[PDB]
Amino acid sequence: MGHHHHHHSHMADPGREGHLEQRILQVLTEAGSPVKLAQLVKECQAPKRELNQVLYRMKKELKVSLTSPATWCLGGTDPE
């Protein structure tokens, strides 16, 4: 798994939505494939509620794309 050595951001992280976003993109990259929203909950260690609001913003920023109803994917890859 590898990523399990990371916790729920124990310290006073100066931008929780940024850290959460970095998690979502990273999970999508490790798979190299569409990751489900329900799976993004357990991986990124954040509630579906919080994920949704961030994910639509990341969609506008082309960071993520929606492949299936409640299944997300990496927006191609890192924008080179």
The 3-class SS string of the chain reads CCHHHCCCCCCCCCCHHHHHHHHHHHHHHHHCCCEEHHHHHHHHCCCHHHHHHHHHHHHHCCCEEEEECCEEEECCCCCC
CA–CA gap between residue 75 and residue 80 (Å, rounded): 12
Query: What is the residue extent of each domain of the chain?
Result: 1-80
Experimental method of this PDB entry: NMR
Question: Could you tell me the fold of the domain covering 1-80?
Answer: Arc Repressor Mutant, subunit A (1.10.10)
35 has which bridge partners?
72
